[PDB]
């Protein structure tokens, strides 16, 4: 989940 969002950065 964290990675799914982290791709933005
Ligand atoms: C959420 O974006 C998220 C959470 C966890 C994972 C993930 C990917 C790969 C592994 C892995 O290779 O584990 C080996 C024990 C674990 N968790 N991806 C994305
Ligand atoms: N928000 N994330 C990024 O901007 C980001 C872009 C690219 C990468 C990355 C990581 C690792 C490799 C590699 N070849 O091992 C390439 N690009 N991370 C984050």
**Displacement of CA 9 from its chain's centroid (Å):** 7
The total number of residues shown for the chain amounts to: 9
Three-state SS string across 1-9, please?
A: CHHHHHCCC
Structure tokens at 8: 């933005």
Distance (Å, rounded) from C-alpha 9 to C-alpha 5? 8
Tokens 């791709």, residue?
Answer: 7
Q: Is the CB of 3 under 6 A from ligand 1?
A: yes
CA of 1 to the centre of ligand 2 (A): 17
Which of 4, 5, 7, 8 for a ligand 2 pocket mutation test, highest count of atoms within 8 Å of Cβ?
7
CA of 4 to the centre of ligand 1 (A): 10
Distance (Å, rounded) from C-alpha 1 to C-alpha 8? 13
* Rg of the chain, C-alpha, whole Å: 5
Distance (Å, rounded) from C-alpha 6 to C-alpha 9? 5
């Amino acid at each position: 989940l964290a990675a799914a969002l982290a791709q933005a950065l």
